[PDB]
Amino acid sequence: MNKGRIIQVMGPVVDIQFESGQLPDIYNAITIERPQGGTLTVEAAVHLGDNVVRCVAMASTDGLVRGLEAVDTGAPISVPVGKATLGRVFNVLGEPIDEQGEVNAEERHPIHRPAPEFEELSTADEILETGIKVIDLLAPYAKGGKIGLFGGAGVGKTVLIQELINNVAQEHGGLSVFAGVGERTREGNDLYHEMKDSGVISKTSMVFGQMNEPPGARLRVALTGLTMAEYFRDREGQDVLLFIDNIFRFTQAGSEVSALLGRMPSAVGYQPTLATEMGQLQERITSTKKGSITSIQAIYVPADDYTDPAPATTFAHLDATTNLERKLAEMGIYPAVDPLASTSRILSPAVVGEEHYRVARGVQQVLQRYNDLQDIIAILGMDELSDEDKLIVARARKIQRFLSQPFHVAEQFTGMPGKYVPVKETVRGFKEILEGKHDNLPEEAFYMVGTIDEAVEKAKKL
Amino acid sequence: VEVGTVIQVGDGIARVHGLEKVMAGELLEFENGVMGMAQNLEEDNVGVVILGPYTEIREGTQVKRTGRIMEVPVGEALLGRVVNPLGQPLDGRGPIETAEYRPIESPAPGVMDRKSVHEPLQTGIKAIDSMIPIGRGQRELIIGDRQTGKTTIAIDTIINQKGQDVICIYVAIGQKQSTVAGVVETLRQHDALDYTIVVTASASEPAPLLYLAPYAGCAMGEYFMYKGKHALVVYDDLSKQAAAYRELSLLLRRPPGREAYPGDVFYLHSRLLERAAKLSDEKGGGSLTALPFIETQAGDVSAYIPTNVISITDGQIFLESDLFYSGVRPAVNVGISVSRVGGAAQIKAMKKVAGTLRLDLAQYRELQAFDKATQAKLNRGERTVEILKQDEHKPMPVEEQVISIYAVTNGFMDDIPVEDVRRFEEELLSFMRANKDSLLDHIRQTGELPDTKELDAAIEEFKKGFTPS
Amino acid sequence: EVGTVIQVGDGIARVHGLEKVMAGELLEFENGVMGMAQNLEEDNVGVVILGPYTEIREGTQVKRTGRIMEVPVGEALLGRVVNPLGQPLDGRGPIETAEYRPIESPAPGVMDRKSVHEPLQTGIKAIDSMIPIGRGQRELIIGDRQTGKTTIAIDTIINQKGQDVICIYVAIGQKQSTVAGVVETLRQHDALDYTIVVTASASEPAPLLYLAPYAGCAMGEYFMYKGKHALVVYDDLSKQAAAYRELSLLLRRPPGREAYPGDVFYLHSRLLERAAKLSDEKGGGSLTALPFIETQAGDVSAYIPTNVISITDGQIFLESDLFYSGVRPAVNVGISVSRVGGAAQIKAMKKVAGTLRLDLAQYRELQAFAQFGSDLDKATQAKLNRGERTVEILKQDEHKPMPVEEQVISIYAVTNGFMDDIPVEDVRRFEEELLSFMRANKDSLLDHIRQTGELPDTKELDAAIEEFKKGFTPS
C-alpha cells in the first residue's frame, strides 16, 4: 500500500506527495501520525500533478510538519455497521465518542458509494405507518421518502423524533440512525441522555459531526450515519429511519470545502457541485425491493427564502413536510403538528385509499373554515355565524383535540400511557366525527386519547 | 490501440498526455471500462471529461481511443429499455444488441428541409388538446413550479400514443431514480412501454451525464424521424441539465454571468430543440416532437433560464400552483399558455368547437376576481372548468373530447348543477359510446363534426334519463 | 532550527528554511519580534507577524521555538489590562504567575459535560425574565451600532459583584481610549477587581485581533477546569473575523462570500464550543460566553452574523427603532431566543415570567388597535393597558443591575394587576419606591427568595404590596 510525504499545510487543506504509479483514489482516507500523539485522517480530493494529492482534513491540522509520513488506507472512510452500533455515539470516522468501551462489529463499510441500481428500486409508493394520527392522516410518510421537519425551539421536535424511533421499532421492527450535522456539543450531550431516559437509545445509532470540527468532517458525517442505515435495509430487510439535523449545515459544509479547494463559486455563493452533492446523499435514501430508509430532515431556510439554492435543491428531494406550530403547543395540543401547513405527496387515492383521502380532505376543509372564522368570531360573536358554520366550528374543535395524542416517550409530561393508533382506526375516527356521530359528546373526551373508542370511553368519566 | 496517460484529474475533469491523433469530441475508454469525452485538444495534452464514476481514475491511469465521434446506440433495440446517456442498459435485461449508431452532436434540419406543422399529436388531455394543441414536429415547453403536474402531462401523452405508431423517448435529467422506476412501471401497466425509450441520468449521477442526457435522447428520436416515422421526445427537465452544465463550466473556470451560468447556456438548449422538427416530403415527411421541461421558482417565468426556453419553443404550457392545489388539475394557466401552431395541430371538429375556448376561460377568471349578463358567463365558466378537470392516467379519445366540449359550450349543462358536471360527462359518454356510436365514428374517420341537429337530439335524449342531486 | 526571510509586506513574512516547523508554531525574528507559522508551503513558510515589521527585511533570520502560543493565567491577571500575548498595558508592573495555558486548546467533549442548570444573572429584567442565560451557555448579543450591546455586557459584569464569578472583557478592534473608558466604568462600580481586560485595539497587528478571543478564553478556562465559574465577553467577533480575513487573503487562501476563507465558521465554532458547563466528575466548573456581532442595517442574514447565530445557544437581538423610542435596553423579545430557557432560572422567576412573555406577545401583536382609543371591547382594552405598563417595567437605566429577588417581585406586581390602578407615566417611580419599601420593611419576603429560590406566601406578598399602594401618591 501507498505511502507519501506532507509538502504543504494550509488551514484544513493538506497536500501530500506520493511515489509514482501508486497514488490514493479520490475519497480515500489517508492517515497521518501526529508528532505529539494521535492520528489525523484526511480525505483525498484532487490530483494536482507531479504525484501530489490535495486532501481535506477531518480534524485539526495544527502541529503538522512538512515531511511526515502519510499512509493510504486503500479505501474511503470505513465505519462499523450492524447491531454493535446500536446505543452508541460515533464521529465521522466511525470511532466511538461515548467512552462506553469497544464496538465489536463484524464488518466495516465505506461511506462513499453509488446510489442503488435501477433494478433494485421499488416501483410504487407505500405508506410508512408511524402510529401518530395527525401525520398518518393529513401528511403521511412514504417508505424511502424524505420529510422536511420545521419548528421553533421548545415545540416538541426532539420528543417527536424519539416517538418515531419508538413506534417504528415497536410495530415495524425497523431500527433508526441519528446524524447530527453540525451538532452543538451541549445539545448532543442532552440528546444522548434524553434518548437514554426514554429508552429509544437501544434502537438508535448516533453520529455527531460537531460544530467545532472542520468543514470536511461536517460534510461527510451524514454519509457515516447513512452507511449504518443502509446495512439494516440491505442485509436485514428493515424499513429504517434516518434523522438528519441540520441538512442545511451539510450544504454549508460543502460550500466551505469548495472554498478551501479554490473552486469558482456558483449562484448565491454556493459550491458549483450543489445539486450533485445533495443528490448523491439523497438518492441513497430510498425504497429498495429488500427494504427502505425513510429520512426526517431538519431544514434551515436562509433569509426565510425558499427559492434560495440550498432549500430549493433540498425541496427537490422532499416527499412531505412536518410543520410544528408553537400556538398548538401553548394550547396543549401535542404533538403540535400544524394540520393545514403540513403536506405530503402520497396523500392521494392512488397510494392511500379513496376513503382515507376523502376523510383527510374533509378534516382539512373543516379546520380551514374554522381558521378563517377566528377574526369574525372574536369581534362579532357566535350569533354572527350561520347554522352551517356553528356545526363546523363545533366539529373542528373536536377534530383539533382528536388530532392530539399521548406519546410513549412523553409519559413523564402528560402522565397517561402512550398510544399507537393504526391508520384504519385514525381514518374511521375522523370519518365518524365528520359524519356527526359524536356531536353530542363533550370536547374534553376527544383530547389526549388513542382510538375513537377511547374517546367514547372517556365521555362517561366526565 | 492508441494510448494516453492521465497527468492531472479533479472533480471528474482530467488532463491526459498522449492521444496524438485523437479527434475533438471523441469517445474514450479508461482502463476500468469507464467512458470519457475528449473536450479540448491542447498543444501537448488533451482535456477529458469523465462520463461516469471517477473514484478509480487517477494520475498514471491509462485511456485509449475508440476512433468514434461522441455517439449512442439507436434503433428498435432500445424500445422498452431503460438506459443511461451512453446507451448502457440499467434495467438488467441483457445488452443492447444493435448495429445502428448516431452522434450526440448533430446538425438541425435546414431552411428548405422543413415543412409547416399540420398533423395532430393527441395528448388525450382535454385542457391541452382543446386550448394549447401540440402538433407533430412542434416544440412545446411545459413550465411550472415543483409538484404542479409536469411529468404527468408527459406520461399521459406517451400513454395516449398506444396504437398511433409514434415512438416515445422519456429523458430523465437530474430526477430521483424512484420516480423514473415508477414511470417505467406506470408505462408497463398501461401497455405504453414497448414503444418507449427511457434515458435516465439521476441526481446521484455526475454532472456531465446530466449534460449529455437530452442529446442522447434526441439522437434516439432523430433515427426514427429521418427514416420517415414520427417520434416524441420529453426532457424532464432542462433546469437540471442547465445547472449540471453550469457545474462543468465553473469547474473548467469559464467566465460566469447571469445567475452564475456560462454564456453558451442559451445555446445548450437552442441547438437541442432545433433538432426537433417536421421534415418535408423530399426528406421522408417524418417528425420529432419535443416537450422540454423547465421548473420555475415561485412561478417566476421572467428568470434567465425560463426566458431562454420560452425564446426557443413554439409556445408554452404554464402550470399554475394556486389552481393545482385547489382542485383544478391539470392546472393550465389560460392567460399566458399558448400554442404557436394552434388550429393547424387540431382536427376540424376540435378547432370549430374549442375555437375561442382559451380566451373565454381567460375572461372568466378575470371576471371571477371582481349584474345579469356577466352572471350567465360565471355560471357557464364554472361548468366548463369541471369538464377540463381530468384524472391522471386516463386519456380521452379526440372524438369523445369534442363531444364533451360541444355539450358544455352550447349550454346543454346549464340546468344541471355544477357538482354533477363531472358525472354528467362520464355518463353522457357511456350513452354516446354504447348507443350513438355512429356519431363518434364520423369524427374518427373524417375529422369533421357530425350533424348539428342530430347531435343536439342525442344529447337531449340522454338528459331525460339523467338524474341530478 | 534557523531560516532566512525571502519577502516581507503588510505584517506577513515568507521564510526560507525552517524545514521541521510545526503548523501554528511560535517563531522569533532576530530583532526580538515574534511570529506565528500559519502557512507551510513547498518552498517557504508563511509567517504572520505579532508586532512591528519595519525592521524585518529580506535576509532577516528567524528562529524556531518548538512551542505553541501560551498565555499567563490565574489570579494575577484579575484587575489588570493586558494584550492577547498576556503583556500588561495598564502601566502597573509585571504579572507574577507560575500558571500558563495554550491559546489553542480542545473543548470539553460530549461526556465531559452536564446540562446547564445554574443561573448567570445579568441583572437586566428583560434578559433574566424572558431570555435567561445559564452558566456554561453561549448567548449571542447582536445588533447595529449604538443599540446598547456593550452596556448589557458591562452591566452583566457589574452584577457579578459578590457572586464569585470571574469576568473577562475581550475588546477586539476598538479605539483604545474607548477601552480606557470601559475600564474606568468598571472601576467606578467596583467591578474591576474580579475582571480581566484583554484588549487588541485597532492599531495592533491583525494576528492580535485574530488571537484576542482565544487568549481571553484560555484565561476563563483556568477557572473553569479548577472548579470555579467564569464569564467571557467577546466585543466583537465581527472585527475579529475581518482580522482573520486580512491574514488569509494576504496568505493567498481562496476567498468566498464577503471575501472570507472556508475556515471562518470553523474559527468561531472552535472558539465558542470551549465555553461549557462541566460535569461533577470534571469538577463542575463553567465558562459562560457572550460573543458580540455588529450587524449592518439590521442584516442578520449576512455571512458572519449567520455563522455566530447558528453556533450559539441563543440570541439577544437589539434594534434601533426601540432604542430611539425609549425602550432601553432595546431588546426585541419576539425574535430573541434562549434554547436553555427555564433551566437557567430559579423557580420564582420561571413562574412569574410565563405570564410576562404571554402578555408582551399579545400587546405588540394587537398594537394596531392602539390608536383607536375607547372604540374597542373590554377584553382588548385591559390587555393594552396591561401591556404598556409591562413595557415600562422592562425599561431600565444604565449601569443599575437589579438583584433577582427584586426582579421577581416587580414582575409579580405588574403581571397580577397591582399597577393597573396606577397611571402609565408613574410605573417606573412606583417600581423604585416599591422595592425601597420592600428592602426596608418587608425583607423577610425578599430573603425567602434569596434562600429557597421560590416565591413566598402569595397572599402575604399581596398584603405587603397593598400596604405600600395606599401610601403611594400618583400624579
Ligand SMILES: Nc1ncnc2c1ncn2[C@@H]1O[C@H](COP(=O)(O)OP(=O)(O)O)[C@@H](O)[C@H]1O
Ligand atoms: N408529545 C408531547 N406531549 C407533552 N408534552 C410535550 C410533547 N412534546 C414536547 N412536549 C413539551 O415541550 C418541551 C420541549 O420539547 P422538545 O422536544 O425538547 O422541543 P425542541 O426539541 O423543539 O426544543 C418538553 O419538555 C415537553 O414539556
Ligand SMILES: Nc1ncnc2c1ncn2[C@@H]1O[C@H](COP(=O)(O)OP(=O)(O)O)[C@@H](O)[C@H]1O
Ligand atoms: N390530473 C391530475 N389529477 C390528480 N392528480 C394529479 C394530476 N396530475 C398530477 N397529479 C399528482 O400530483 C403530483 C404532482 O405531479 P407531477 O407530475 O409529479 O408534478 P412535477 O413533475 O411538476 O413535480 C403527483 O403526485 C401526481 O400523481
Ligand SMILES: Nc1ncnc2c1ncn2[C@@H]1O[C@H](COP(=O)(O)OP(=O)(O)O)[C@@H](O)[C@H]1O
Ligand atoms: N438602558 C439604557 N438607558 C439609557 N441609556 C443607555 C442604556 N443602554 C445604553 N445606553 C446609552 O446608549 C449608548 C449605546 O451604545 P453602546 O452601549 O456602546 O452600544 P453599542 O456597543 O451597540 O454601540 C451608550 O452611549 C449608552 O450610554
Ligand SMILES: [Mg+2]
Ligand atoms: Mg416530475
Ligand SMILES: [Mg+2]
Ligand atoms: Mg460597543
